Amino acid sequence: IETVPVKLKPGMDGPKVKQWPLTEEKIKALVEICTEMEKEGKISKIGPENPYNTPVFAIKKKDSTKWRKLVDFRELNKRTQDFWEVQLGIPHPAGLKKKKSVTVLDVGDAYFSVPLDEDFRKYTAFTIPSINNETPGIRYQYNVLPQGWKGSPAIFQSSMTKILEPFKKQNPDIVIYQYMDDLYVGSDLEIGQHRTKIEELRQHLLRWGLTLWMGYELHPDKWTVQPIVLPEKDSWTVNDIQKLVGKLNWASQIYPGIKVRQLSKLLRGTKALTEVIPLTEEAELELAENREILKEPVHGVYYDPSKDLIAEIQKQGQGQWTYQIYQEPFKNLKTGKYARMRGAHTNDVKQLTEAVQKITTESIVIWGKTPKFKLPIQKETWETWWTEYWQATWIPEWEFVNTPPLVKLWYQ
Amino acid sequence: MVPISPIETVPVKLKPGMDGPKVKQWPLTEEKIKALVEICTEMEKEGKISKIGPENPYNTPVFAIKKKDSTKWRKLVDFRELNKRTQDFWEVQLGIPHPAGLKKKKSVTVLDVGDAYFSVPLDEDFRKYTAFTIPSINNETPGIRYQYNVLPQGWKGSPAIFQSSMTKILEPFAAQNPDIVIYQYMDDLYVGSDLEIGQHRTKIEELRQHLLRWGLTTPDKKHQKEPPFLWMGYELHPDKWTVQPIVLPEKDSWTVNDIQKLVGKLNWASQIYPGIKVRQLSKLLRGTKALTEVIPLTEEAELELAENREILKEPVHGVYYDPSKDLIAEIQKQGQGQWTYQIYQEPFKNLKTGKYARMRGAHTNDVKQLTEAVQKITTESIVIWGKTPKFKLPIQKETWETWWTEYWQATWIPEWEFVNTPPLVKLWYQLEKEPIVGAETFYVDGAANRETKLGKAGYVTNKGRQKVVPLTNTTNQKTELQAIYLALQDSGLEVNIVTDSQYALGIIQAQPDKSESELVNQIIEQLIKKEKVYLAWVPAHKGIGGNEQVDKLVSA
Numbered sequence: 001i002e003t004v005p006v007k008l009k010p011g012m013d014g015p016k017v018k019q020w021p022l023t024e025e026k027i028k029a030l031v032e033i034c035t036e037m038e039k040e041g042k043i044s045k046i047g048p049e050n051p052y053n054t055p056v057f058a059i060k061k062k063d064s065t066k067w068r069k070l071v072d073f074r075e076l077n078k079r080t081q082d083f084w085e086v087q088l089g090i091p092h093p094a095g096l097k098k099k100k101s102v103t104v105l106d107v108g109d110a111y112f113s114v115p116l117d118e119d120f121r122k123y124t125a126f127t128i129p130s131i132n133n134e135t136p137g138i139r140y141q142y143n144v145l146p147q148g149w150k151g152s153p154a155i156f157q158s159s160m161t162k163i164l165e166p167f168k169k170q171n172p173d174i175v176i177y178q179y180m181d182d183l184y185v186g187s188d189l190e191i192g193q194h195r196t197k198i199e200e201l202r203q204h205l206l207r208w209g210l211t212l213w214m215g216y217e218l219h220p221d222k223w224t225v226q227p228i229v230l231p232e233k234d235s236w237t238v239n240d241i242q243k244l245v246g247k248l249n250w251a252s253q254i255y256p257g258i259k260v261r262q263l264s265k266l267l268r269g270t271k272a273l274t275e276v277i278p279l280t281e282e283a284e285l286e287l288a289e290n291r292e293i294l295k296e297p298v299h300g301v302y303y304d305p306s307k308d309l310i311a312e313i314q315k316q317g318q319g320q321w322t323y324q325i326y327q328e329p330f331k332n333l334k335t336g337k338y339a340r341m342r343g344a345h346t347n348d349v350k351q352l353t354e355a356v357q358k359i360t361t362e363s364i365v366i367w368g369k370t371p372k373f374k375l376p377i378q379k380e381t382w383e384t385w386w387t388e389y390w391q392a393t394w395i396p397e398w399e400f401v402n403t404p405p406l407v408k409l410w411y412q
Numbered sequence: 413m414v415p416i417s418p419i420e421t422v423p424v425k426l427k428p429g430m431d432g433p434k435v436k437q438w439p440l441t442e443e444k445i446k447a448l449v450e451i452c453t454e455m456e457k458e459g460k461i462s463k464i465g466p467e468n469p470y471n472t473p474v475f476a477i478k479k480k481d482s483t484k485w486r487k488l489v490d491f492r493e494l495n496k497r498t499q500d501f502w503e504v505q506l507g508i509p510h511p512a513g514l515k516k517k518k519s520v521t522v523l524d525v526g527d528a529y530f531s532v533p534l535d536e537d538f539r540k541y542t543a544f545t546i547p548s549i550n551n552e553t554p555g556i557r558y559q560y561n562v563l564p565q566g567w568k569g570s571p572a573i574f575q576s577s578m579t580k581i582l583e584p585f586a587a588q589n590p591d592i593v594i595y596q597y598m599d600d601l602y603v604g605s606d607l608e609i610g611q612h613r614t615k616i617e618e619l620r621q622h623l624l625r626w627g628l629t630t631p632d633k634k635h636q637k638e639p640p641f642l643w644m645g646y647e648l649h650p651d652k653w654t655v656q657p658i659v660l661p662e663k664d665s666w667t668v669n670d671i672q673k674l675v676g677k678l679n680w681a682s683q684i685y686p687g688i689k690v691r692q693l694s695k696l697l698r699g700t701k702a703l704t705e706v707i708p709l710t711e712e713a714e715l716e717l718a719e720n721r722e723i724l725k726e727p728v729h730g731v732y733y734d735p736s737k738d739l740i741a742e743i744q745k746q747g748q749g750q751w752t753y754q755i756y757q758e759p760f761k762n763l764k765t766g767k768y769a770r771m772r773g774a775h776t777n778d779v780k781q782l783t784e785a786v787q788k789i790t791t792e793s794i795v796i797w798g799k800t801p802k803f804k805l806p807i808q809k810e811t812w813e814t815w816w817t818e819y820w821q822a823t824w825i826p827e828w829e830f831v832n833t834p835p836l837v838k839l840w841y842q843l844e845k846e847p848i849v850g851a852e853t854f855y856v857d858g859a860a861n862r863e864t865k866l867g868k869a870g871y872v873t874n875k876g877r878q879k880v881v882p883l884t885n886t887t888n889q890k891t892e893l894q895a896i897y898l899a900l901q902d903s904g905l906e907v908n909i910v911t912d913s914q915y916a917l918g919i920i921q922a923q924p925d926k927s928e929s930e931l932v933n934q935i936i937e938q939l940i941k942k943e944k945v946y947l948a949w950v951p952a953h954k955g956i957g958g959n960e961q962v963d964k965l966v967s968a
């Protein structure tokens with residue numbers, strides 16, 4: 001029941017991040033939520049001798065209609081002393097990505113029973129803002145561990161084991177992983193039988209309470225990585241062959257032995273674009289050979305946990321989106337395609353925002369760390385609306401893409 | 413005596429790794445020194461300060477100015493080096509309330525808490541760094557020592573420590589007086605109700621006594637200044653507000669401390685006066701970094717400052733904000749990258765107005781400008797009213813749909829409706845997605861020579877039409893564009909164009925409708941006249957027909 005000493009890193013102050021404007025209903029809802037968390041001792045008012053701040057805002061989580069309190073702990077997390085004291089942090093389970101199914105369970109609800117180190121609470125400062133800057137902002141600090149802080153799982157780490165040693169020993173088939181305030185639970189089981197072993201853990205997390213009710217169902221074994229394919233036609237126009245040679249030329253940056261000499265030859269001259277060109281046998285050969293090369297994966301594409309993960313997203317239209325994760329250009333560690341039906345249809349930014357969430361989930365599962373996104377959106381449009389659609393309790397980093405790539409077609 | 417509730421103390425430290433101030437008291441004239449002991453003697457008589465002994469080693473200078481137009485001396489501690497050693501405070505200073513966001517309340521009182529500042533105690537452990545010396549006459553005695561026991565004038569923490577103190581005291585009165593509103597900005601207390609002025613002036617007394625119970629002194633008699641106030645550059649009336657009148661300075665030659673007190677005095681006007689523009693006066697600045705340099709006024713500006721002496725002539729007032737009714741925002745394209753907006757709830761009655769200027773980009777188009785203004789008005793509305801206005805926008809719904817469905821970036825604007833008041837924002841051209849059957853195919857190419865800067869640009873086509881034009885003082889990027897321009901210039905209403913210029917695709921795929929490059933502008937005007945254009949890209953140096961038998965033509 002005693003706190004665990006936490007420091008920042010030397011030469012770093014606490015976070016002093018501005019709170020951005022919130023709508024009236026989101027302020028109204030944070031006020032009630034923070035008024036219960038005050039009564040429950042989870043937070044306490046603070047005074048102006050506290051210089052620190054961390055933005056806060058309000059959401060609804062999936063298939064629930066109750067405002068939830070989200071705290072963007074990104075900047076504190078950069079400044080927080082990574083916890084390599086006893087253990088060097090929970091290693092990533094390479095087995096979690098190889099599982100027929102993975103369910104994500106919100107265990108943040110447990111964090112609020114652990115006290116936080118009184119020296120450190122000054123650093124979790126946040127502010128409910130007022131409309132129009134009329135009344136000053138309502139300031140609180142955290143007493144318990146904060147949902148969204150990277151220290152909260154690190155510190156619950158040991159204590160989360162003594163809840164899960166019964167279960168891990170009971171089902172040594174399962175892999176169970178924790179990132180932030182989420183529990184990732186993977187089994188090779190049948191899906192009906194995988195759901196049962198989950199509800200097994202919902203009740204086993206109620207027993208510990210005495211001394212968090214729904215299921216998000218990934219399938220890392222109902223997805224893989226994505227080859228570059230070439231069209232298959234009986235007749236080709238000049239345009240068809242120009243797009244081909246373009247795509248092969250781009251793919252040659254990735255796969256070395258790709259050749260376009262005999263297809264290019266057909267593009268000699270200046271025929272009309274919609275004109276059918278017969279393929280030379282040299283060119284049919286060169287195309288078949290390229291198709292070969294593109295069935296192998298890339299050689300020497302190794303993850304390196306000392307470098308950053310980058311995520312690029314392209315808008316393909318009609319609710320379809322593509323993405324690539326990598327560390328070094330052309331050495332993709334995963335690629336993918338996200339698709340519509342999901343409050344999409346008429347709001348690109350909700351699509352993009354959901355797409356950023358799925359990729360970051362897939363990214364936790366594969367490496368236990370979030371990538372830096374390159375978004376195909378104006379900074380100003382994105383910063384205005386992304387919180388209106390966010391549902392997850394973590395937040396990745398992002399920058400913004402302002403030049404339309406040619407590559408959209410190639411990934412198409 | 414009825415006892416005063418004591419005001420709880422805010423702990424204050426120095427900054428990590430800092431001593432306290434150790435600065436000499438300046439030599440003061442003789443009469444100045446007489447005024448300070450006079451001031452400090454009554455202050456010590458009031459519990460505000462207190463003499464200190466020969467231990468306290470910290471010292472802050474103190475001056476005395478004459479309160480001009482008065483024989484009363486004004487004292488003044490100069491806390492600069494103390495502030496430099498004081499910790500940082502939480503700062504609620506971020507935001508000055510905007511008049512348009514105030515609700516219309518029937519009765520309104522403002523009270524200046526210029527005093528109670530000195531009633532708010534100071535952290536005992538921090539009193540001893542507020543020490544100062546009243547130097548003596550002829551330096552023939554020690555200076556009279558002193559430290560502060562309440563929040564000291566012009567100190568780092570005083571406005572923050574006062575504000576929090578004040579809010580604590582105000583919570584329970586508000587909570588149990590929900591039939592009134594109380595805002596809290598500056599050292600000023602805003603109070604307001606829809607109660608009739610008898611029960612309004614009632615609760616104004618009640619709060620006066622509630623403030624007594626802690627030690628806070630309120631202007632009992634009628635405050636000399638009563639609504640309407642001219643406040644912080646505005647004029648706040650019981651049914652309306654406007655900007656405090658501000659005429660524009662006149663100059664035969666405008667320096668830079670002039671055009672900045674003119675684009676500043678004009679950015680202020682535009683928040684209620686609709687249609688203010690400031691472009692041909694802001695170009696004369698960002699291309700200049702000298703606070704006394706002179707620039708004559710451009711030909712386009714001296715008709716513009718005659719427009720800003722033409723809006724600022726009749727009174728325009730804003731109204732107050734009524735939560736029951738919908739918020740509307742309306743935008744108008746004002747030309748040359750400027751946008752003007754009116755936020756209102758009822759026709760003709762503006763809450764507030766404003767402008768938007770394009771970002772200093774290289775190419776641009778009307779829709780991304782309209783989109784960017786919506787996002788500004790949206791953040792600005794969230795700030796002032798706590799909600800997003802419904803938009804009425806000079807763009808057809810069909811145009812917006814073509815744009816965002818085909819735009820390579822994700823984009824979005826909130827709920828809006830078409831207002832048919834020109835100039836309408838439109839799509840000037842649209843590229844085909846497939847090649848055009850029956851359209852002539854122009855394989856284009858360009859190249860220059862980096863040293864001689866010379867180059868060529870042209871096309872060859874499928875019907876044998878060719879052209880190569882020589883060019884002087886040009887670049888690879890310039891000739892790649894020129895090649896495309898030539899092909900548009902000599903083609904029919906429908907045209908397929910092959911280039912290898914990744915530079916060109918990138919410009920055209922951003923779909924500008926206006927450009928800094930006048931070459932790009934002409935391509936744009938050529939595109940506007942065509943019926944269909946398919947722009948295809950092929951990679952270079954593959955001797956890709958068009959771009960071989962014209963790569964071998966333009967580098968020859």
Ligand SMILES: NC[C@@H](NC(=O)c1ccc(-c2ccc(Cl)c(F)c2)[nH]1)c1ncc(CO)s1
Nearest residue numbers: 134509522524595596597600602637641643
């Ligand atoms: N008694 C006058 C006193 N206050 C005002 O003039 C005044 C006018 C309007 C407001 C106001 C409006 C909205 C909000 Cl939300 C608010 F918190 C305050 N304040 C002083 N102003 C400048 C002084 C320098 O000597 S003194």
